[PDB]
Amino acid sequence: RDPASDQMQHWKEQRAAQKADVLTTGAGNPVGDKLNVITVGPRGPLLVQDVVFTDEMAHFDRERIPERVVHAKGAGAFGYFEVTHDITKYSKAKVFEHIGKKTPIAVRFSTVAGESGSADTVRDPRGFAVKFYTEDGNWDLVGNNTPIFFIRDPILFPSFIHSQKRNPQTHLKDPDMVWDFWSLRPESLHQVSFLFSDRGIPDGHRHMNGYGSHTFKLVNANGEAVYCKFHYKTDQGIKNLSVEDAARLSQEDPDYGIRDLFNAIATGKYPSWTFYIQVMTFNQAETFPFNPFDLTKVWPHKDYPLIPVGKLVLNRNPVNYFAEVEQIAFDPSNMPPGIEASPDKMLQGRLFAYPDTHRHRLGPNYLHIPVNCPYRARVANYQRDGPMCMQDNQGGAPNYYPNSFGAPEQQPSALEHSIQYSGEVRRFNTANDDNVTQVRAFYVNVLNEEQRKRLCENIAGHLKDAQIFIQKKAVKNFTEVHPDYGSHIQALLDKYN
Amino acid sequence: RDPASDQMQHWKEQRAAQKADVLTTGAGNPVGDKLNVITVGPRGPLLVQDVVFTDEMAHFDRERIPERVVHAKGAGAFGYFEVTHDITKYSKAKVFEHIGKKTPIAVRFSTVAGESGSADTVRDPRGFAVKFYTEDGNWDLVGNNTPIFFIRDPILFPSFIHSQKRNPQTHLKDPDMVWDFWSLRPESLHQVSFLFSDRGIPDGHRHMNGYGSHTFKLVNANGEAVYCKFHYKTDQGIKNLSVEDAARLSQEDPDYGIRDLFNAIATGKYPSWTFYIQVMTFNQAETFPFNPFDLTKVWPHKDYPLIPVGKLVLNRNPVNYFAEVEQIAFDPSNMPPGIEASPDKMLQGRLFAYPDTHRHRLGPNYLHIPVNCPYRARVANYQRDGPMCMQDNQGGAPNYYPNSFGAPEQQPSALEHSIQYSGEVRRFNTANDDNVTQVRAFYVNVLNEEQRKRLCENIAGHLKDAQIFIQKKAVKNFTEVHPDYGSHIQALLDKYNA
Amino acid sequence: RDPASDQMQHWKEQRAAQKADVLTTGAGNPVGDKLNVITVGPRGPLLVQDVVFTDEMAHFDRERIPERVVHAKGAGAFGYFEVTHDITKYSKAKVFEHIGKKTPIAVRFSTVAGESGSADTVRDPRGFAVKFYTEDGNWDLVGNNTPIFFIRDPILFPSFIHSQKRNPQTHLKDPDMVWDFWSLRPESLHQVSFLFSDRGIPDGHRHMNGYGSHTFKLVNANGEAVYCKFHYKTDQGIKNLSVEDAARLSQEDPDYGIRDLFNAIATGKYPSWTFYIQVMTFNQAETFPFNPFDLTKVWPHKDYPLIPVGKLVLNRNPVNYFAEVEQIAFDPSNMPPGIEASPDKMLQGRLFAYPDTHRHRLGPNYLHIPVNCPYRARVANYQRDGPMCMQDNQGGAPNYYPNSFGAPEQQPSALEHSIQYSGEVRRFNTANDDNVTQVRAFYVNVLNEEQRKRLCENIAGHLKDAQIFIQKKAVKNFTEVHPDYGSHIQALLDKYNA
Amino acid sequence: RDPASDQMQHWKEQRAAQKADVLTTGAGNPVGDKLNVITVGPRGPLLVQDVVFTDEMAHFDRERIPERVVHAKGAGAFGYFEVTHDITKYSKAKVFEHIGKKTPIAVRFSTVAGESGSADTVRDPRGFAVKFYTEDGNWDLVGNNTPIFFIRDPILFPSFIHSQKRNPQTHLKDPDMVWDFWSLRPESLHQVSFLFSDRGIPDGHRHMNGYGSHTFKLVNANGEAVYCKFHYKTDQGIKNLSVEDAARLSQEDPDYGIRDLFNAIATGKYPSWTFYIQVMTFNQAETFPFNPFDLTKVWPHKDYPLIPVGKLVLNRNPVNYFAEVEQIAFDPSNMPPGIEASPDKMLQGRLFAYPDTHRHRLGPNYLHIPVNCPYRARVANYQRDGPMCMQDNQGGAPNYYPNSFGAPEQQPSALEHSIQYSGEVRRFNTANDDNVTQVRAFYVNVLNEEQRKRLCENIAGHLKDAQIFIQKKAVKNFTEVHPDYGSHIQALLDKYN
Ligand code: HEM
Secondary structure (H helix, E strand, O other): OOOOOOHHHHHHHHOOOOOOOEOEOOOOOEOOOOOOOEEEOOOOOEEOOOHHHHHHHHHHHOOOOOOOOOOOOEEEEEEEEEEOOOOOOOOOOHHHOOOOOEEEEEEEEEOOOOOOOOOOOOOOOOEEEEEEEEOOEEEEEEEEOOOOOOOOOHHHHHHHHHHHOEOOOOOOEOHHHHHHHHHHOHHHHHHHHHHOOHHHOEOOOOOOOEEOOOOEEEEOOOOOEEEEEEEEEEOOOOOEOOHHHHHHHHHHOOOHHHHHHHHHHHOOOOOEEEEEEEEEOHHHHHOOOOOOOOOOOOOOOOOOOOEEEEEEEEEEOOOOHHHHHHOOOOOOOOOOOOEEEOOOHHHHHHHHHHHHHHHHHOOOOHHHOOOOOOOOOOOOOOOOOOOOOOOOOOOOOOOOOOOOOOOOEOOHHHOOOOEEOOOEEEEOOOOOOOOOHHHHHHHHHHOOHHHHHHHHHHHHHHHOOOOHHHHHHHHHHHHHHOHHHHHHHHHHHHHHO | OOOOOOHHHHHHHHOOOOOOOEOEOOOOOEOOOOOOOEEEOOOOOEEOOOHHHHHHHHHHHOOOOOOOOOOOOEEEEEEEEEEOOOOOOOOOOHHHOOOOOEEEEEEEEEOOOOOOOOOOOOOOOOEEEEEEEEOOEEEEEEEEOOOOOOOOOHHHHHHHHHHOOEOOOOOOEOHHHHHHHHHHOHHHHHHHHHHOOHHHOEOOOOOOOEEEEEEEEEEOOOOOEEEEEEEEEEOOOOOEOOHHHHHHHHHHOOOHHHHHHHHHHHOOOOOEEEEEEEEEOHHHHHHOOOOOOOOOOOOOOOOOOOEEEEEEEEEEOOOOHHHHHHOOOOOOOOOOOOEEEOOOHHHHHHHHHHHHHHHHHOOOOHHHOOOOOOOOOOOOOOOOOOOOOOOOOOOOOOOOOOOOOOOOEOOHHHOOOOEEOOOEEEEOOOOOOOOOHHHHHHHHHHOOHHHHHHHHHHHHHHHOOOOHHHHHHHHHHHHHHOHHHHHHHHHHHHHHHO | OOOOOOHHHHHHHHOOOOOOOEOEOOOOOEOOOOOOOEEEOOOOOEEOOOHHHHHHHHHHOOOOOOOOOOOOOEEEEEEEEEEOOOOOOOOOOHHHOOOOOEEEEEEEEEOOOOOOOOOOOOOOOOEEEEEEEEOOEEEEEEEEOOOOOOOOOHHHHHHHHHHHOEOOOOOOEOHHHHHHHHHHOHHHHHHHHHHOOHHHOEOOOOOOOEEOOOOEEEEOOOOOEEEEEEEEEEOOOOOEOOHHHHHHHHHHOOOHHHHHHHHHHHOOOOOEEEEEEEEEOHHHHHHOOOOOOOOOOOOOOOOOOOEEEEEEEEEEOOOOHHHHHHOOOOOOOOOOOOEEEOOOHHHHHHHHHHHHHHHHHOOOOHHHOOOOOOOOOOOOOOOOOOOOOOOOOOOOOOOOOOOOOOOOEOOHHHOOOOEEOOOEEEEOOOOOOOOOHHHHHHHHHHOOHHHHHHHHHHHHHHHOOOOHHHHHHHHHHHHHHOHHHHHHHHHHHHHHHO | OOOOOOHHHHHHHHOOOOOOOEOEOOOOOEOOOOOOOEEEOOOOOEEOOOHHHHHHHHHHHOOOOOOOOOOOOEEEEEEEEEEOOOOOOOOOOHHHOOOOOEEEEEEEEEOOOOOOOOOOOOOOOOEEEEEEEEOOEEEEEEEEOOOOOOOOOHHHHHHHHHHOOEOOOOOOEOHHHHHHHHHHOHHHHHHHHHHOOHHHOEOOOOOOOEEOOOOEEEEOOOOOEEEEEEEEEEOOOOOEOOHHHHHHHHHHOOOHHHHHHHHHHHOOOOOEEEEEEEEEOHHHHHOOOOOOOOOOOOOOOOOOOOEEEEEEEEEEOOOOHHHHHHOOOOOOOOOOOOEEEOOOHHHHHHHHHHHHHHHHHOOOOHHHOOOOOOOOOOOOOOOOOOOOOOOOOOOOOOOOOOOOOOOOEOOHHHOOOOEEOOOEEEEOOOOOOOOOHHHHHHHHHHOOHHHHHHHHHHHHHHHOOOOHHHHHHHHHHHHHHOHHHHHHHHHHHHHHO
């Protein structure tokens, strides 16, 4: 059968010659019998001194860790990034230092709202997270399959996640929550139009693009800084699943994406993505018609063309899923010198959110789980102890800074880039920014007639389950985007109602 | 629109008169604005001073707790147990003390292998766990929808659970693991025959029976002990979903059971169960043809009739799912005086397994989560502290026993019943016990022709995905049960393999 | 016998009439016998079904939580704050709203570096943390017994804490670490001079002052803001322990402060503190000779007089130490409307550091441990779940914002005060700020001859154990403060080294 | 200066030639400046963008783990055990398999009741825990400096521990609790007499003996079983501190034992212990005048002589205290084939108590913290996942047993020895066992006049702080042991009162 079906057979075939290992306890003590327990006679009660049973049973009882608060259902793979073009005039990061340089990568794909156990082929944004193991530490590009997101302020993210998830009382998916949140926040129209198009259900993880979706800052060796976007487009082509096909697959094969990626890598059909950047100077960031740090906007390709950088290749399947996929952690704040953060508020909130959730989910010392370790860099600092400190704890080195005993020193060349900001320190309302121009451009100029009609059908078929007043508010926003948009959606809703 | 769809509308309607509450932080400080963050200028970076954002963000980051290692996907409800018949001659537990007395209950239904997010209408055993809030402490009857289980020794339970879950490398369901484990352990044939019949997919949680699968010990006020089984049959009738209907429902409505139970309770259609016991004397346990403490065997009804006890009724929906259903914990060791454990090895392992996993999953002080608290009895002991110690940590009372300062004292009437056992202390092999007699009885006498044909078709349609040698071993076990069983399964496998 | 010695006798005396409680398990099941375990025969092995022993033992195995990373050794008490003067022109916080208003408080005193188990009467700064339970949420004033601290940048705090604690290899106190850090960072001279004076060892917790030590921002109802300091001076008088007396007490009574506070409150001798503020306008902050947000500086009293505000009274002893003292958590970010943070970098770091460490030490839901709960305010937000959720989890209320179903709304009057800042966003060096002027003022004008000579003796007696080059660097800093300071310390060091 | 105080100087001297390391974050990213934070101008507020500060600060905030519920204050060392005599007729354990074989060991010394920060030189029992790294798994001999203990039933251990610690309200040491518990349970008289003698305060950890204190079962290769006791006597000699000297040292040097052990090993003065066993046949365990599995009784030397086995030597100091001493865990259930548990009820309770508390204190995967790992054995079983799994999660091997794919198998030779027991299954009262015979033997025949007088003075000076009726009950128990004992204690109490 398929290589995923033959995992145990393949393992047995590689271990055909050798004799089976001796079964031991967690402390290495050999086990005499692990099929029966110690009782007082044949029909008597169990004994405490059966420590083999207790040792196995307690560890079984402690197997689960909390799942991710979002993107719980996921698939992992490994490979490398290779440089194909020179962009050293924009960035001085070691990952781009010369043409042909290779950096090992780790990649996790995921959905957003479904828990670990839900189906892969549902309408949802897709996570595309890449971990670069560079000599200047780990670089995490925690991206999506869309260049934009629903909201533009990080304080609304927990509310959006709650509204996309189950009702707090009935534990059911509630369209009222979803559509009340979306109609009260019309800045989500762009990503809603993206989500309900054909690209909302990709045909596996190999047939979709990846976007960092934030503005980032590139600094070169001379100290000059530019703003950038990150793109990586699939070399396999964009492929999508129809609504009926996805509905069938969700029942027949709830793990469609995992099986597809594993069977592709196992047969040597390695998927690749071509890595691009967009570049915006500060002067033309001043004159951009929108806010260039707004997560609901893209940079048009005519004014900001793609610049090739390299390519991402995935050629290795995980050996153990729990150790390499479930325990992997991506922190957007993991940036080497040459890559920095832009003043995008969403990115600013993400700078705190991810290590904070990783400490809770995995542990304070999660950075030295082997899949998360920066094994191509040298870690030396004044941090000590913590639960599950699996090292020499940096030995007997001095643990305070500054000192006069030869402990590690700071590197002045790794200093951040300086920007002067104007304005007072307060909360600025961004709910009334431009919400319809790029949505109108997508509706009129990007989609053709059939894609547009399918998008309207999908929106109506999801929105018809909500209350009437939420329907009117959503239709009002859609009519603000385009009158035909709202009118078609309202006609389909009238048919449903 | 069903009442489940109108949850927010109903909540808004009960609060029509009142003005909305003031939005505060976790420390109660009122919040000025929670739609925008604090930046230096309109297009500047974020400030640490925005403690409102950090306070909400970290709590959102800490929302998830580890799911149950088994029975992760579940549905909760609440109600009461009522006594309708007198069994005081068998047990002295306060829950059965007189006819007509009521005890509040909490119930969780669940599947077994699927995690959170998996579908409800799949072929699986169903959990039926009942928590009695009794004045003599909490009593947990952690039952299933089948009277039997796959294995009879508790040390094989982690291996069986692993074999029914995802492959450790590919993270996929692996028929090889499932059927290799089942063919290497032929004592699972009885529960496999149960599982692949029509009752493997119940039509919601209201149309299925509940069984305390282990044998238990009942002690009366005179110190006499008997062995017992627990049954509670649905008053709604047994109803099952066909394979095609369940397949359609799994993708159309993955939360079919939760919605069904909630909409039943919300409309006033309260599901009910009739509570029964089987009773075996110790002489009858000596003369029983099998081991009476074997989890792969039942007590036949013609020799051990059902004795009515009471009624289980569920009439209240959960108010908050996470606090009442996700955080509820059932410990089989929670037994009041009058109810004890039998020497069933599975039950003995479960006596340790559940509080240990509860301490891991919820916390050391999980017993004082409000849904888990024994609020109808009085807690007084010499246990102190631990993480999240609420109330007053039993005040300044003496924390050592014995003492001379009026601290709580042991109650001699609550002493366990004493039994003399014979034999050596070692591991006794039970893999070669009788594995086919009751399976043959179920195959020949219980099922009719159509149910038998569907059972064979289901078994073949699952086993076809396994390797050839595992197929032959499983067919050998089925032929050991009955020649026609194995012959039909092999013929269907031959059709599938070509 | 003191009342602390008679705790158990008193508890027995209040329970003279009533009969002792029944000893139960954690689930409320009555215990037959808790002095012997279940064995097969008198000389046989232990049984799993002895669940009483397992429950008690497993709970005993989990009663330790991690201690505080600093201020581990501490003492707690409770009382109230009362307003005696009108400061409504400066702040609109409800805690100061009218004269005579009372607010319940909780107070923890502590040392800094010693772990839970170390002695009380050692040379160290003392923590003085006050938690106000106001109707606008909880307000925590996490203060010290000194108005200043050793460093002025929050990124050096873990290094300073490590240097004051045990060596990473030998696990011993290492004067090399302490004095190398202090000599490499000359900004610590002011707080070092404070620490090695007579007030470095107070005579219990009732004979010492308390300082917020940070500049804070007070905003009134009209939107005008001022900068403020917080003071609360002991009404019992400043009293200190000599070096020899403290050394004797450390081994004779390692819990001197706890016993002193408990016996004071138990006999009705309630300690009191008078609450003051200093007020700086923004123009005065512009014209201040130093940085007014520097943690190594004080505001001189002749230019910024004390303004009386209120009264802190402690009159209730803790009932259970672990529940009310070990589990209490103070967050400087807990500020009601009318009180805000200043741009002091140390305060900015603390704003993140304290809830972050509370989530790890106590749990994500630590704010609803009863001693930490804002029980005089109404908590309503969109935060849900988390481990050990011990309420209705806010029921079935909508959990997203904004919504259209009557869920809690933001309060616009609780918005923060707005300030425009100038300059680039980068790291600014503050190591070369003024380090010796206020230290010289303290050395020359505050201390008399005997206090000065004792201070020099204490400094030399601690610094003698360090290496020679660190001794020269420290002596160089002391000579920078004053030539006689450094010369006296060097002469005493010369005597010690020979 | 002692070598302990020159730790940083020594580290700097071994790192004199090399250049200092570059200071990085936990993810390996080089740090530009770690002395100042990022603010909005010289006097502005702090930025979230300062991820270096947050990364260091959160880890500092997560440094502490819960201390041990008992024996919190401790000192660690490392070395080896060597076989000097042949006892293979009693045991088939690989650790004793031939003369001259070495096995690496890890040792922790500790007090009992004091927490971290408390003084070393106080009157208390001393823990002497030895971890053998054996090719048949790890063997932990969790011993004490006394052959006996206060109680004989494991269900009273939490009550005794609570009574020896702080009052639940005042958080102070309460003599009422201690002496009420001791007078209500007169089986503690033997260990109380031991504790209040001169050996209650050892002169460091090198001048004291070690005892397993339990009866254990030794099984040879032919299946024959015997009962045994474990002894290891100090080759440095028994040395004790006087009450006044210990009181002075507690104030002056609260870490006297740690410094003494470290400076002994650092200067090459390696402490050693001689390893002995007592042997009781199953026939003569029936005719023993007491219960041979009673923790309040010893086996007399004239009837059960010591049999030499080997030497315990400590020659290596810890490199990092937290990783090697604070995180080390000893499980009495860690026993290789050839060593088993006896029906001692205290040992049976300890079989459950220690792994249960280790899972809470350190983590579910505490057995693979490097100091706890059985690195000289091969670990292979069907346990998977759990928090903080750091090696491979045993790869893609089959995780269920039995299987048909070559996974590890049980070893029938490692089966336990089987014993038939008689009697009912219930709770048997052991409070009325013999409580005074061996105490009387110790009082009359072991101690001389001066030691006896000092013991009486110490007991009186501790008991005078308790209430009067507790004093009478304790005096009644002491008079039961010997009339002169109780009369002297009562006269001293009368002087105090
Ligand atoms: C029923 C009786 C006992 C129980 C339940 C018990 C329980 C415990 C527990 C929970 C710990 C904490 C371990 C850790 O957190 O690392 C501990 C430590 C310890 N116990 Fe016991 N104990 C008992 C009696 C004894 C006896 C009889 C001995 C010696 C003969 C002993 C010697 C020790 C030692 C040396 C340690 C420190 C181990 C280390 O250095 O990590 N205990 N005990």
